[PDB]
Design an enzyme around this catalytic site. Structure first.
Site, PDB file in Angstrom:
ATOM      1  CG  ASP A  91      43.461  63.033  15.666  1.00 33.45           C
ATOM      2  OD1 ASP A  91      43.173  63.411  16.820  1.00 33.45           O
ATOM      3  OD2 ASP A  91      43.986  61.927  15.424  1.00 33.45           O
ATOM      4  CB  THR A 123      48.177  62.336  18.085  1.00 32.29           C
ATOM      5  OG1 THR A 123      47.429  63.320  17.360  1.00 32.29           O
ATOM      6  CG2 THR A 123      47.228  61.532  18.953  1.00 32.29           C
ATOM      7  CB  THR A 124      50.020  67.279  16.723  1.00 33.76           C
ATOM      8  OG1 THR A 124      48.750  66.877  16.200  1.00 33.76           O
ATOM      9  CG2 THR A 124      50.805  67.986  15.635  1.00 33.76           C
ATOM     10  CG  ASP A 155      41.117  64.087  19.658  1.00 30.01           C
ATOM     11  OD1 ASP A 155      41.322  62.865  19.507  1.00 30.01           O
ATOM     12  OD2 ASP A 155      41.779  64.965  19.066  1.00 30.01           O
TER      13      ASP A 155
HETATM   14 MG   LIG Z   1      44.185  67.929  22.057  1.00 33.99          MG
END
Ligand SMILES: [Mg+2]
Ligand SMILES: Nc1ncnc2c1ncn2[C@@H]1O[C@H](COP(=O)(O)OP(=O)(O)O)[C@@H](O)[C@H]1O
Ligand SMILES: Nc1ncnc2c1ncn2[C@@H]1O[C@H](COP(=O)(O)OP(=O)(O)O)[C@@H](O)[C@H]1O
Ligand SMILES: [Mg+2]
Ligand SMILES: [Mg+2]
Ligand SMILES: [Mg+2]
Lengths: 525, 540, 147, 105, 364, 96, 77
Positions: free
Chosen positions: E3, E36-37, E337
């Site tokens: 994450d 989020t990345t 997620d």
């Molecule tokens: Mg994802």
């Protein structure tokens, strides 16, 4: 001789003093450093600063507010401390003008340094500055325009002032939306000046344009376990009672019996007292009950059985805002139901903002209290948006209190400088030079404002000065393209109070700093 | 030149006399006198720049880095971090002048420095310091007699305050608050005259409350013939303004009674619990009813109160204020004409104070609320509220107002005045010079030194204003000799004339007398010291 | 001072009347005790412990001289030289236990205030030598010679 | 005569007159304050009426001391022990002067 | 962890730009829960391009406005590529969950995890007339040991508290009651003492204490309750030994030290209404359950499960298992997620292709 | 600073009076007592340890006295007179 | 140190005059015990055990270590 440069030493270790030239040098250096630091964040095209704390938590703050910049800096120069306190007091008095007053004071002290270098006694400079300040204040007062009588014109002036205040800050991206938001929030106060009635809720996530002014009110509290989560046509009772292991206030009282059956009887009596208090509360005929203090499990289930919402731990600000928005009375005794007014609103429900849940009051009766939800991409963005909105709300409240307005974009500064020059042209002695320096600083303010945008500041200032000398009293800087224009048509206006306070505070601080000819420091602790 | 003595005996055996004598220091005789004179001269030369309307301020920084900008000599010397004993003597002399008079705290230090500077040359000529001290004392006696001779009386009557206004303006001329000169002087005069026992008795300063709040303008400083209170109304929904308020001052918290002696109330049955609850409820209702029965409109408490009392007060149209300080309670009782009541059982109509207007005042975007209790009938207490652009000018205005109040108090105590601007100093120097001619030769030198030291105040005033000191002082002295007029001084403000009587530069006679007396006594005390024994340990 | 219980003394008040009357009764008791002491003809009271404020008041009212000797040795020596017996209670002294002296007064010698118990007769159980001198060491040496 | 510095007056002192033309002075060693009757005094009650009676008894003790002082005819009151604000206000209401914690000498 | 928000916030970055990027990732996690990345890499790429833009001699204000225009155009393009989706289509939900789990360590267990996450989201919301999902209604319980294949979707609630009433487990037709008072000796809120001046009183004290405790237990039993949950008490003893013995002798399961924060969840799941005084403890305030049993996890711990509830609430519990703690934490993050992805599909029900398609279309 | 002022130099000791005489006589007496028992035909021998590592096992008084080191100058005078007696006549070093 | 600004110590008046007398008296008191037929000799140790038993005044002062300049005058005398 002098204390420092004497064959015998009169001080303890670590305590020194600075004579005339050295004290003036240090004071001017500190003031110029403060002014240079606070400037470049001035005007529509001013950048922001990063305040990286050196503390253990290392707080990160991205801000454009000059007062906040000067607040969180380690300052050892005493004149810099004077300027910082000036900025803080300016922020306390009115929401805006901190950078303007700080830069004006710094420019005034730079001109004072030049005059001192030109062999002019500081008292002459002070007298000339007093005369110039009087002339500039008279000119600005004569230039004020009032539009409070006309509702539509006053509303337009409020929108213009909010836009001008928000032009420099980060909210200039959505200036229109944020100006409408701020004007509506201020107008909902119905003339009251308490900004504490306006609550700003910062929820992370979402674009900055997702921020909105709620039509009712929002509370960040919870509801009892067995109580309704949604009521219609609410009759709200706001209270400040305990309802948590409520003890009789006779502190010396105690239970002293000779059997556990009596203890059980007293415990049942205590529970009966709590039940009777809850029944007295319910006798008011209410649907939702809001208490400032905690609500324990027994009154919680008592309310739940009656189908009454019981919002607990709404602090003093919370209960005050609920009373303002709904019209209820904060009650602590319930022996007279007919003497207590109950707040009313159309709907109470739970809304889903971000990942958190809040209580939403819709269709409030009074509504003289607002909540603003700010959505941003970073915590720094949220903090800066809150600070900018606070500045806008403060200026709008000041304008509501005093409806006199003056034109911005350097127009007021140019008019003040023109009046000061006119006064100085008919005065003999070096006080004329002092007033000329005053006018130079007043003109340097819009010069820095133009420099921040990268325009030809010298040419623009010359054009503005010529226009003001000719008779064009509303000419000002137009930053859409980088020319001069009519501030009345272009709708750049400021509160008269803010400009007057900036001028007077800057003059006062320059006067008090200039009078100093010796700085004596005690031994640091 | 130090370390006392070191001989270790002529037989070689150890010779220890005083504990830690090898780490101590001492100075004797003319060397000690010269060191004292040098230290006093340094202090006086530092202080002399802050004299007169053109005098400049000193920025003082304490241990914690807090900054005070001031022109008050006593404050400057008090905050100055000295180590020399003579410097401490100068600081204490300035504090003494502040305590006794309240003004002239800078002139005393300059006068003492000038006296010791002249004594330096006198000692170099070979005169015993006791002779110098005696000559200084008798010259000071002559100067004081001349000051009494050339003094003038003023009217301290309430109907005409113009001489008082002029005196206060002269006091405030050197301070930064001269931008509001006449306003500040007039509010100070009105404050002193309001709180004063008429028959030349004392003016009690606990009846004057001086408060400073940031923001606004310095011109917004005003005189409130009542009390300003940092507190506000207890309930947020209480009305923010009361008209023709009938105050009820109480020192009892609106709580159930509590005996001071250690006590325990035993609850032994359910009936006991019911009786206790009913007792609490009825006590609250009874205290509210007792307050209401007197017809009062506002209730002022000192020790705060709880939620039930607050809501009962709100419900019964009784605005109230809690946690008011004891001095504030006393001031409210004095101003409103009411009596302090210790419990509700003793509250009556005749003990209620009356105020024309009680209001809550906002201060912009600060959330800070303060209470005004004004428009009293015959308020015997007064309050001064000071505004400004920063706290530093607020503190300076506070001390300037204190100086003005002290000067008007001195005028009340004694109504004789002399005209400042160095005119009094020049006249005293001339009187001392005429007296010196008739005196035998030996004390003539001391008297002439005293006169020359007295001449330093006009020199400092002229130099601070940019004029040439010696030429201006000599011209003024020649004019004073030519025409008998002890009112000619140094035209610091460049108004054109030298007559200080016309320029309305007025000072209290007792202030000048105290200046000369204290300076002479301190100079004698320093001149009589011929030995120092410091520890010299350089301890940390 | 009025004697107190040795285990633990607490004033248990149950009504308002007792609370109002307690201090008045205690003061009356102390006054009665002091007056009973004075009625025996005694005019000097020497105590080996602290003196209560009320006791001092009522002693001053009846013109009684107070001396407070901290050290038990001085009290014993005074009993020897006057002829009195150290009573353990505030009871008035009987005829035999009452001490007698020719004169007792407060006097100053040099710069030290002293209390003098003086016999006019050329006799007594204890006699004292008052040593004067310009130095403490000299008086100590004279005391050694006296020993 | 005798003179000494003013010793920490309480609230309500400024309404006392500060000049007397033939005063009678009550030299006292008394603590005129609301306080515990004794350091080892414990009050045990089991009725609210007794609670009110105890409070009124404390007030009545203090007021009895003050009334005896007032009826003594004195106008100036001096005490080695502290004099509370209640007593100061009581004496101010009677146009009397009070001063507590006066040094013993 | 994989994450992006967890990686960014787990390591101190010490640089203001890096900290603002961490806050950006946190905000994206709050609003979206995944991606989020991608957002951080996009911001880094934008600033990297800004380097050359500034070096070319462009003021960093034209760049901001041009970026705003580009963002608006890109939003339009992304909306154009979007495809309408309704929650009734389970295949799209499963595909979205599988795509979310593709990049995590539980990619191999996706075939079990993704339907579990979809069912968990759909259980706690109404498929129609829903605008948001409160993930706090889905409780994740991490129990060490076993296999990620042993992850479960118990539809009741799981309590980590042990059963004090040892010897009675797995009661059927449970009538659960949640009390907020204490089953101990009487005690009033105001301080109380009992004075004894006679031995008869001293025996009567114990006799009456026993009688009071027995009366409390008998009144609890008379309602038909057989499972008792006791809220945690700090000041007063929540459950005395005598009370526990009396409850055991009357065949009632006793579970103490229930946290105050879990009262809302327990009442929403079972349907019980909390009781704070014995006077209001009646049968109507009891939650009926089909089974309430304690199960051991192959020697790795004990869990209490209450499966099967009349009128079940809008809550579910997910039990996560794993060999070691690190993979358990990562499995929890990946399941979160997936739940966030389904939530984002609940509001603004639009779908786009992945695999870099929307972003390369944005670039073109 | 201000180093102490002295008439004589530092570390310069001085003794005087009866103490000096008593110390000198006691040092001489101790020197005599060292070799008192090495006189006559029935004398016992002494073992002396040289600082160089050698061993001097002797009955002669002069050798014993010269093989020891003393600090009191009176003892030095005694050693010197022993050496003088040894050099002048050749024996009688213990007797003197 | 003060206004003179000399890197050294200073003594003036009766302070130095007494020191000179004290220093001169110290030298005399050394040799006062070696005067006349009833005088007694002195023993000098030279920090390495060298012994010098002498009664001559000059020899005693030759070997002594004197620091005070006034004492040195008498020693050279
Ligand atoms: Mg994802
Ligand atoms: N749209 C605009 N056009 C021209 N000048 C502006 C505009 N908006 C703000 N200004 C000027 O910028 C100056 C500084 O405002 P700002 O930086 O927002 O707060 P502060 O007054 O605290 O510096 C104001 O004096 C105003 O005249
Ligand atoms: N308007 C004036 N013109 C000439 N001299 C003045 C005037 N006002 C004050 N002075 C002189 O300045 C001197 C200093 O006064 P001030 O600084 O106010 O207090 P201090 O005497 O403590 O320094 C006084 O002795 C007074 O004579
Ligand atoms: Mg602004
Ligand atoms: Mg003055
Ligand atoms: Mg032989």
């Amino acid at each position: 001789a002098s204390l420092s440069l004497a064959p015998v030493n009169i001080f303890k270790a670590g305590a020194d003093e600075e004579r005339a030239e050295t004290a003036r040098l240090t004071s001017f250096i500190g003031a110029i450093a403060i002014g240079d630091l606070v400037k470049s964040t001035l005007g529509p095209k001013g950048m922001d600063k990063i305040l990286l704390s050196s503390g253990r938590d290392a707080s990160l703050m991205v801000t454009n507010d000059g007062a906040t910049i000067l607040k969180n800096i380690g300052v050892d120069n005493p004149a810099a401390k004077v300027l910082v306190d000036m900025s803080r007091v300016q922020d306390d008095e009115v929401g805006d003008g901190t950078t303007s007053v700080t830069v004006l004071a710094a420019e005034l002290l730079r001109e004072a340094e030049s005059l001192i270098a030109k062999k002019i006694h500081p008292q002459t400079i002070i007298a000339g500055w007093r005369e110039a300040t009087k002339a500039a204040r008279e000119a600005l007062l004569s230039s004020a325009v009032d539009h409070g009588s006309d509702e539509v014109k006053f509303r337009q002036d409020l929108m213009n002032i909010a836009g001008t205040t928000l032009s420099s800050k980060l909210l200039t991206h959505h200036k229109d939306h944020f100006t409408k938001l701020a004007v509506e929030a201020v107008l909902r106060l119905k003339g009251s000046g308490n900004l504490e009635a306006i609550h700003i809720i910062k929820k992370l996530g979402g674009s900055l344009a997702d921020s909105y002014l709620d039509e009712g009110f929002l509370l960040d509290k919870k509801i009892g376990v067995n109580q309704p989560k949604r009521i219609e046509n609410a009759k709200i009772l706001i209270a400040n009672t305990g309802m948590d292991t409520d003890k009789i206030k006779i502190f010396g009282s105690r239970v002293r019996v000779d059997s556990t059956a009596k203890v059980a009887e007293i415990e049942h009596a205590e529970k009966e007292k709590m039940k009777e208090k809850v029944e007295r509360i319910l006798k008011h005929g209410i649907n939702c009950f809001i208490n400032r203090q905690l609500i324990y499990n027994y009154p919680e289930q008592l309310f739940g059985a009656a189908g009454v919402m019981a919002i607990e731990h709404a602090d003093f600000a919370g209960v005050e805002r609920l009373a303002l928005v709904t019209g209820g009375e904060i009650a602590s005794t319930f022996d007279h139901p007919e003497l207590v007014k109950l707040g009313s609103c159309k709907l109470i429900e739970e809304v889903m903002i971000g990942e958190d849940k809040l209580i939403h009051f819709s269709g409030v009766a009074l509504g003289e209290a607002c909540t603003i939800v700010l959505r941003g991409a970073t915590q720094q963005i949220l903090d800066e948006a809150e600070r900018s909105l606070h500045d806008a709300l403060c200026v709008l409240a000041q304008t509501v209190k005093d409806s006199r307005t003056v034109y911005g974009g350097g127009c007021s500064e140019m008019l003040m400088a023109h009046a000061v020059t006119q006064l100085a042209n008919r005065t003999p002695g070096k006080e004329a030079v002092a007033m000329e320096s005053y006018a130079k600083a007043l003109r340097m303010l819009p010069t820095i404002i133009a420099d921040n945008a990268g325009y030809d500041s010298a040419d623009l200032v010359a054009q503005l000065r010529a226009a003001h000398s000719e008779g064009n009293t509303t000419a000002g800087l137009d930053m859409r393209e980088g020319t001069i224009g009519d501030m009345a048509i272009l709708g750049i206006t400021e509160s008269f109070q803010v400009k007057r306070q900036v001028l007077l505070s800057a003059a006062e601080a320059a006067e008090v700093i200039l009078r100093v000819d010796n700085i004596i420091k005690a031994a640091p602790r | 030149a130090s370390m006392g003595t070191l001989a270790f005996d002529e037989y070689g055996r150890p010779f220890l006399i005083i504990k830690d004598q090898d780490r101590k220091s001492r100075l004797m005789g003319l060397e000690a006198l010269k060191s004292h004179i040098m230290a006093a001269k340094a202090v006086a030369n530092t202080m002399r720049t802050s004299l007169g309307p053109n005098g400049l301020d000193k920025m003082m920084v304490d241990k914690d880095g807090d900054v005070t900008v001031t022109n008050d000599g006593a404050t400057i010397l008090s905050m100055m971090d000295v180590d020399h004993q003579i410097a401490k003597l100068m600081v204490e002399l300035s504090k003494s002048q502040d305590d006794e008079i309240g003004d002239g705290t800078t002139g005393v230090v300059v006068l003492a420095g000038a006296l010791l500077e002249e004594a330096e040359q006198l000692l170099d000529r070979g005169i015993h310091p006791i002779r110098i001290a005696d000559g200084y004392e008798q010259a000071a006696r002559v100067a004081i007699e001349h000051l009494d001779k050339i003094s003038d009386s003023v009217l301290v009557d309430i109907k005409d305050t113009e001489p008082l206004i002029q005196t206060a303006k002269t006091t405030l001329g050197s301070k930064v608050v001269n931008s509001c000169h006449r306003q500040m002087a007039e509010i100070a005069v009105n404050a002193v005259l309001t709180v004063a026992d008429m028959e030349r008795r004392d003016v009690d300063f606990e009846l004057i409350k001086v408060e400073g709040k940031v923001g606004g303008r310095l011109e917004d400083t005003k005189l409130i013939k009542g009390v300003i209170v940092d507190k506000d109304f207890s309930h947020p929904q209480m009305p923010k303004k009361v008209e023709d308020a009938k105050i009820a001052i109480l020192t009892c918290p609106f709580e159930p009674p509590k005996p001071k002696t250690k006590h325990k109330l035993d609850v032994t049955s359910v009936e006991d619990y019911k009786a206790l609850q009913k007792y609490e409820k009825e006590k609250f209702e009874e205290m509210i009813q007792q307050i209401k029965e007197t017809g009062a409109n506002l209730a002022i408490c000192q020790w705060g109160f709880d939620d039930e009392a607050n809501h009962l007060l709100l419900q019964n149209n009784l605005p109230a204020v809690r946690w008011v300080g004891g001095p504030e309670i006393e001031l409210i009782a004095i101003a409103t004409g009411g009596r302090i009541v210790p419990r509700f059982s003793e509250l009556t109509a005749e003990k209620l104070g009356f105020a024309g207007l009680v209001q809550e005042i906002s201060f912009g975007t600060t959330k800070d609320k303060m209470l005004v209790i004004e428009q009293c009938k015959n308020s015997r207490a007064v309050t001064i509220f000071i505004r400004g652009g920063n706290k530093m000018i607020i503190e300076e205005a506070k001390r300037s107002l204190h100086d003005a109040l002290c000067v008007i108090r001195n005028l009340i105590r004694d109504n004789r005045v002399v005209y400042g601007g160095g005119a009094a100093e020049i006249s005293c120097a001339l009187a001392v010079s005429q007296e010196a001619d008739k005196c035998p030769t030996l004390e003539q030198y001391a008297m002439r030194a005293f006169a020359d030291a007295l001449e330093v105040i006009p020199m400092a005033l002229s130099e601070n204003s940019g004029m040439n000191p010696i030429q201006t002082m000599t011209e003024v002295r020649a004019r004073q000799v030519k025409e008998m007029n002890p009112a000619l001084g140094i035209d610091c403000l460049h108004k054109g004339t030298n007559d200080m009587k016309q320029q309305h530069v007025i000072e209290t006679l007792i202030g000048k007398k105290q200046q000369i007396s204290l300076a002479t006594q301190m100079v004698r005390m320093i001149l009589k010291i011929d030995d120092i024994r410091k520890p010299g340990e350089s301890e940390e | 001072d009025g004697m107190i219980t040795e285990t633990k003394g607490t004033v248990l008040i149950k009504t308002a009347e007792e609370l109002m009357n307690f201090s008045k009764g205690e003061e009356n008791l102390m006054d009665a005790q002091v007056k009973a002491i004075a009625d025996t003809g005694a005019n000097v009271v020497v105590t080996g412990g602290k003196v209560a404020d009320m006791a001092l008041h009522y002693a001053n009212k009846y013109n009684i001289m107070l001396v407070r000797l901290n050290s038990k040795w001085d009290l014993r020596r005074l009993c020897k030289t006057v002829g009195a017996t150290a009573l353990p209670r505030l009871t008035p002294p009987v005829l035999e236990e009452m001490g007698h002296c020719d004169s007792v007064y407060l006097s100053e010698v040099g710069d030290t205030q002293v209390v003098v118990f003086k016999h006019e007769k050329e006799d007594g159980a204890i006699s004292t030598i008052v040593l004067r001198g310009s130095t403490d060491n000299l008086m100590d040496d004279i005391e050694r010679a006296v020993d | 005569g005798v003179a000494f510095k003013k010793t920490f007056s309480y609230a309500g002192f400024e309404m006392q007159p500060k000049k007397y033309h033939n005063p009678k002075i009550a030299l006292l060693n008394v603590e005129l304050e609301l306080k515990a009757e004794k350091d080892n005094a414990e009050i045990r009650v089991h009725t609210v009426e007794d609670y009110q009676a105890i409070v009124d008894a404390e007030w009545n003790i203090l007021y009895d001391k003050l009334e005896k002082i007032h009826h003594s005819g004195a106008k100036v009151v001096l005490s080695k022990l502290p004099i509370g604000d209640v007593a100061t206000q009581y004496f101010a209401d009677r146009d009397m002067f009070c001063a507590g914690r006066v040094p013993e000498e | 962890t994989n994450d992006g928000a967890t990686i960014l916030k787990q390591m101190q970055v010490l640089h203001p730009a890096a900290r603002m990027l961490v806050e950006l990732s946190k905000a994206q996690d709050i609003e979206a829960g995944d991606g989020t990345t991608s957002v951080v890499i996009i911001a880094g790429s934008l600033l990297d391009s800004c380097t050359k833009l500034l070096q070319k001699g462009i003021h960093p204000t034209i760049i901001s406005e041009s970026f705003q225009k580009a963002l608006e155009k890109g939003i339009e393009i992304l909306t154009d590529m979007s495809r309408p989706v309704e929650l009734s289509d389970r295949e799209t939900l499963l595909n979205s969950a599988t795509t979310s789990l593709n990049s995590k360590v539980v990619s191999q267990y996706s075939s079990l995890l993704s339907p579990m996450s979809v069912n968990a989201v759909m259980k706690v919301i109404d498929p129609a007339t829903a605008t948001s999902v409160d993930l706090r209604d889905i409780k994740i319980v991490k129990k060490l040991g076993g296999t990620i294949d042993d992850c479960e979707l118990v539809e009741g609630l799981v309590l980590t508290q042990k059963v004090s009433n040892s010897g009675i487990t797995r009661v059927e037709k449970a009538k659960i009651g949640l009390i907020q008072f204490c089953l101990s000796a009487p005690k009033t809120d105001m301080d109380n003492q009992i004075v004894v001046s006679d031995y008869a009183q001293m025996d009567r004290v114990l006799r009456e204490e026993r009688a009071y405790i027995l009366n409390l237990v008998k009144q609890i039993k008379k309602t038909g309750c057989n499972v008792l949950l006791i809220q945690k008490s700090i000041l007063r003893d929540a459950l005395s030994d005598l009370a526990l013995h009396f409850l055991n002798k009357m065949k009632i399961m006793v579970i103490k030290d229930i946290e105050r924060e879990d009262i809302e969840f327990i009442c929403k799941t079972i349907g019980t209404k909390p009781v704070a005084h014995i006077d209001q403890f009646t049968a109507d305030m009891l939650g009926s359950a089909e089974l309430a049993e304690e199960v051991n996890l192959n020697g790795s711990g004990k869990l209490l499960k209450i499966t099967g509830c009349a009128s079940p609430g809008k809550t579910v519990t997910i039990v996560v298992r794993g060999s070691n703690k690190l993979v358990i934490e990562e499995a929890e993050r990946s399941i979160h997620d997936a739940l966030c992805v389904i939530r984002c599909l609940v509001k603004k029900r639009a779908l786009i292709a992945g695999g870099g398609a929307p972003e390369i279309e944005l670039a073109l | 600073g201000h180093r102490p002022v002295l008439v004589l130099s530092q570390n310069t000791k001085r003794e005087s009076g009866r103490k000096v005489q008593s110390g000198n006589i006691n040092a001489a007496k101790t020197i005599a007592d060292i070799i008192r028992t090495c006189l006559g035909p029935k004398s016992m021998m002494k073992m002396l340890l040289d600082p160089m590592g050698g061993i001097v096992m002797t009955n002669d008084g002069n050798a014993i006295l010269r093989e020891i080191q003393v600090q009191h100058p009176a003892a030095k005078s005694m050693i010197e007179i022993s050496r003088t007696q040894d050099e002048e006549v050749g024996d009688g070093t213990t007797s003197v | 140190e003060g206004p003179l600004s000399v890197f050294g110590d200073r003594s003036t008046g009766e302070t130095i005059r007494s020191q000179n007398v004290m220093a001169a008296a110290s030298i005399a008191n050394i040799v006062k015990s070696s005067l006349g037929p009833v005088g007694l000799d002195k023993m000098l140790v030279d920090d390495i055990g060298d012994v010098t038993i002498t009664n001559d005044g000059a020899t005693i002062l030759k070997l002594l270590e004197v620091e005070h300049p006034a004492a040195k005058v008498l020693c050279e005398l």
